[PDB]
């Protein structure tokens, strides 16, 4: 679909049976979700934005559906203020930026 | 142009007769530039990202050309890791997300 940026680009995603709102972020290299339980083994990582760095748990090969499109990739879980779908899964659904 | 997201969406912006590289960020409500000298008065702003909040200086009605498109708006200057073109200027050059 075409999405305007007059308003923040929030979409419903489905992860582990749970439905959630997530921000489509082209400034985000990786996808970061708010604290949750994901199966499998994770490794620790430190990621930085405005304001600095936060510690997250990295899970690889997690399947997530973004508006009906299935996508699989690394998902970071940690104390993020909002769920963010980064470039690593935006490319998988064919998302591009146009003007 | 159509920009895919396999790489970070970086463009050249011209501000103050100077060229710089900035990130097109749909996840940023505002535009934040690394420390620089801009004309006029400024007023204070608190902005929060993934690592918490930073205090920045707000300048209004600044001309900035993003890929040969002249935009005129609010630019925040402060301790950002990278120059960020936010939604307030991405809407003025007609940018949308498509998949
Ligand atoms: C973990 C992701 C989110 C992170 N990117 C961001 O935080 C980018 C900026 C950046 C890019 C590249 C290197 C450093 C900083 C900004 C995000 O788009 C964030 C997403 C967000 C929205 C709402 C609340 C909290 C966060 N937007 C954001 O911080 O907005 C402002 C206006 C403060 C710039 C990233 N990408 C690469 C390294 N870190």
Swiss-Prot record, chains A, B:
Active-site residues from the entry: 25
Residues covered by region (Dimerization of protease): 1-5, 49-55, 88-99
Domain Peptidase A2: 20-89
Coiled-coil ranges per UniProt: none
Function description: Aspartyl protease that mediates proteolytic cleavages of Gag and Gag-Pol polyproteins during or shortly after the release of the virion from the plasma membrane. Cleavages take place as an ordered, step-wise cascade to yield mature proteins. This process is called maturation. Displays maximal activity during the budding process just prior to particle release from the cell. Also cleaves Nef and Vif, probably concomitantly with viral structural proteins on maturation of virus particles. Hydrolyzes host EIF4GI and PABP1 in order to shut off the capped cellular mRNA translation.
Subunit structure: Homodimer, whose active site consists of two apposed aspartic acid residues.
Name of the protein this chain belongs to: Protease
Residues represented out of the complete protein: 501 to 599 of 1447
């Amino acid at each position: 679909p075409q999405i305007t940026l007059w308003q923040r680009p929030l979409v419903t995603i489905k992860i582990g049976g749970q439905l959630k709102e997530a921000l489509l972020d082209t400034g985000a290299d990786d996808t970061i979700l708010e604290e949750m339980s994901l199966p499998g083994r994770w490794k620790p990582k430190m990621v930085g934005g405005i304001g600095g760095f936060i510690k997250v748990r990295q899970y690889d090969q997690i399947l997530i559906e973004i508006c009906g499109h299935k996508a699989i990739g690394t998902v970071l879980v940690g104390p993020t203020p909002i769920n963010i779908i980064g470039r690593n899964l935006l490319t998988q659904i064919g998302c591009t930026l146009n003007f």
